[PDB]
Amino acid sequence: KPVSLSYRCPCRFFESHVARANVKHLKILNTPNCACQIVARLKNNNRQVCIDPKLKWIQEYLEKCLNK
Amino acid sequence: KPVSLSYRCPCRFFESHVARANVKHLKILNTPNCACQIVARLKNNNRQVCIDPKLKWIQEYLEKCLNK
Numbered sequence: 001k002p003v004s005l006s007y008r009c010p011c012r013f014f015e016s017h018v019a020r021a022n023v024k025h026l027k028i029l030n031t032p033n034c035a036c037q038i039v040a041r042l043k044n045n046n047r048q049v050c051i052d053p054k055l056k057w058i059q060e061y062l063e064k065c066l067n068k
Numbered sequence: 069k070p071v072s073l074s075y076r077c078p079c080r081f082f083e084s085h086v087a088r089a090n091v092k093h094l095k096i097l098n099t100p101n102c103a104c105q106i107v108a109r110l111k112n113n114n115r116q117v118c119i120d121p122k123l124k125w126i127q128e129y130l131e132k133c134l135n136k
Contacts (some may be wrong), residue, residue: 027097
């Protein structure tokens with residue numbers, strides 16, 4: 001469900017025990033008026049969870065996108 | 069379908085005419101030996117395509133995740 005919506009953000013609460021080693025990939029949702037919505041899909045036994053860009057490893061994930 | 073690869077990178081060819089207004093969400097694949105793999109799924113009739121993190125608006129998309 002890719003919900004591009006404003007003010008009410010798809011992720012109000014975020015998963016905070018997320019580990020990049022467990023994250024298979026990240027998903028950044030498009031919200032016209034919300035902060036960067038980031039989803040972490042975790043490997044095999046876990047589910048897909050929504051997390052927050054406050055997470056420092058998240059920023060590094062995207063830092064890898066930046067200038068390589 | 070995010071393929072699990074390393075060193076060999078999933079996206080060797082990337083969609084180049086991707087627009088932020090057309091992207092519904094971005095998906096960053098976790099590669100420990102590739103510097104960021106980004107997928108854009110475009111709105112309504114469009115499909116899912118892989119793009120490159122070198123894209124300037126992409127970097128800004130993630131800048132919105134950077135300290136906010």
